[PDB]
Scaffold this active site. Structure first.
Site, mmCIF file in Angstrom:
data_model
loop_
_atom_site.group_PDB
_atom_site.id
_atom_site.type_symbol
_atom_site.label_atom_id
_atom_site.label_comp_id
_atom_site.label_asym_id
_atom_site.label_seq_id
_atom_site.Cartn_x
_atom_site.Cartn_y
_atom_site.Cartn_z
ATOM 1 C CD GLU A 171 21.486 15.106 1.923
ATOM 2 O OE1 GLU A 171 21.177 16.293 1.995
ATOM 3 O OE2 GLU A 171 21.474 14.535 0.851
ATOM 4 C CG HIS A 187 21.295 11.235 -0.454
ATOM 5 N ND1 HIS A 187 20.364 12.129 -0.091
ATOM 6 C CD2 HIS A 187 20.658 10.060 -0.594
ATOM 7 C CE1 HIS A 187 19.206 11.507 -0.004
ATOM 8 N NE2 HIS A 187 19.403 10.263 -0.307
ATOM 9 N NE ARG A 225 11.046 10.806 -5.091
ATOM 10 C CZ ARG A 225 12.145 10.012 -5.114
ATOM 11 N NH1 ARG A 225 12.177 8.813 -5.703
ATOM 12 N NH2 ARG A 225 13.263 10.455 -4.533
ATOM 13 C CB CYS A 257 16.870 8.811 1.551
ATOM 14 S SG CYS A 257 17.104 7.417 0.366
#
Lengths: 210, 210, 210, 210
Positions: free
Chosen positions: B81, B168, B91, B144
């Site tokens: 990342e 990831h 969510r 994360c």
């Protein structure tokens, strides 16, 4: 009530003969809807030059709200961007051959700028009219993220009263004829863009649905 | 120059009783490869508590390099990342029922932190071994990204000598049995992770490619 | 109790350097597992010549079961094919420049042939071992469908005692390095293929599920 | 010379109150365009009963050309089908609770039937008007394939003069509001369908493309 709304769309690039972001914002030029009075300018898909053209459009129009629009080929929904990143990382050269790799947009600027638009409110309103929308958390590292970061940088440093942001739009059907990719018709995209400008003119703040 | 490399993987996140990020980093615990000496710790998939567990792992192990790993179901490549974002926007609820929406991770912290790892170099080395890798520019807004941002904040403010980042990984095949989605085998993922730890321990500077 | 299982794989096409279907069936050559005794032959990715090579492999080995394997780049699961179609419709030329468009494989042959393998049973057995599998209902119209149809035609007209079919497999990771696409490791693919040969050798009859 | 073209669409299935295949063909009912005179009938999303309703529509209207339309949620293009398969394999029950698994549509019928429409011609004409189209080689094994096979069976055995086929259409935008999926607007789909009817009414001969 009257809020002046500047919309920008990009010119065509990399093979294509049409940029839907410009085709959609061009037909909203001069529109008045609710409190919004809309003007539209075209920005070149060129690093560094796009930002100079945007600064000129801000001087000439003195807008209260700026929404810059670009095409994101491959997505399925109208996506308002939450974050602009301080990086130019071009996979392909722009329209004038510049291909920056690993370059800061603002040397010593923040790593990122958040959007100033009420994007969750915009997404719920576009969806109420039956067209798909969602918030995106990366605008890429090409000219579209460059103009978004440059816009937010200009606002923060020189025009703190302006509410500004970026919205990415899909391909239109005519562009997926030889390559199957999702698209939305130009009529739904210009409608979504009009709803975005009006929602940003009426609403200061955003709602908490997420 | 022996560099101690701390690796973390999340505990099973409600959906399965196995999390691949932990399964992969747990088998590299105690591994020594070139200059790298690797230790592995498990972090809970819980907002706020994950960061407390990380702070404790930093005190106990005194690492020179920290690579936090998590699962990104749906991706096709190992993705280091580039950017952590100051936002918790859940969510779904975490393992203890927290579901923050629109919340800052660090009140008054920067909008984003860049990774401290040589991620382009890591991507090219994983690819030299035949396994797909690419840099990603959003790590999501769930636990994360939370840990990634919290990590870089800890480093910036209290441990400036540590090189840290987030990687990831995809689903493993066993997780796509009822739902078709891409995956990479656990043997390719643990191999990619060992190459990342070794590349980060041997080079302080990154390559410029993208 | 012993059944000779002939597996075939194609050589590479497009611009690939390995064809995983051959790499996987090559390492099963000479394997004996339960009732199955496996032999492997390579078929060229050439229209009309592939069929001639297969007829020769049938004469030489006298198999009880034939499973032809080819690569389906872009899929995410091992997919046994239910139907072969009487059509050569080449988007790209084969390895020797043939590019048939709208051509019958067998002039006056049926429009389609069903597989002779217990493919629902095969799918359930591969998934019991943790690897994704599903039946597919189109094998394309290139050399892979050509060989499938030609195989079933050969069986129906000249070798009615043979059980024959086709299994499409994904890319392996090493092929998705410059283009992100799903893949399955070569170890998972050869293990799925050994399970398919053993399941086909042990049962003449299929289960009824999906 | 006038060709009566019959179009069908299905009734609501699955928690919806409108079905796009029916919404699109219903507005073409009574249209006359070139040599085509169009009539539209609705068919139930029910195995076995759909076929009975189609036979009744054939008796009543005496069509020269029949094009049955159904929705294929997830596709990105208008797709005329090349092949109907003799199999009812239902993943989900139809509107009246029938869920056939591994069942022949016609016991002793051929394994497949080819379309009777000039589908390559239809695909190029829809694309000339700026909307995406491509031929598909599997129409699934649910009620849509069921009606397509049953239609071609009826034509082959009892109405050899009728030119018939099936066209699958995407979701419309309104249906991808909670689940992101590709879509085409209902205006583009009904325009594609009218172009299909008129191309089939004017040309018995198909073209040869790729």
């Amino acid at each position: 009530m009257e809020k002046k709304v500047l919309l920008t769309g990009f010119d065509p690039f990399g093979g294509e003969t049409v940029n839907p972001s410009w085709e959609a914002v061009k037909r909203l030029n001069g529109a008045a809807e609710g409190p919004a009075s809309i003007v539209s300018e075209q920005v070149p898909t060129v690093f560094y030059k796009s930002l100079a053209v945007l600064r000129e459009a801000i001087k000439k129009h003195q807008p209260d709200i700026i929404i810059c629009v670009g095409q994101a080929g491959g997505r399925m929904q109208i996506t308002p961007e939450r974050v602009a990143i301080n990086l130019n990382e071009a996979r392909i050269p722009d329209n004038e051959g510049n291909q920056p790799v690993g370059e800061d947009i603002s040397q010593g600027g923040p790593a990122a700028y958040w959007t100033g638009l009420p994007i969750k409110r915009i997404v719920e309103e576009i969806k109420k009219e039956g067209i798909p929308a969602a918030v995106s958390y990366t605008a890429g590292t090409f000219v579209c993220n460059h103009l978004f970061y440059g816009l937010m940088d200009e606002i923060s440093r020189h025009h703190p009263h302006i509410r500004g942001g970026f919205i990415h739009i899909p391909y239109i059907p005519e562009q997926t004829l030889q390559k199957s990719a999702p698209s939305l018709s130009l009529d739904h995209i210009t409608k979504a863009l009009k709803i975005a400008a009006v929602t940003a003119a009426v609403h200061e703040d955003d709602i908490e649905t997420g």
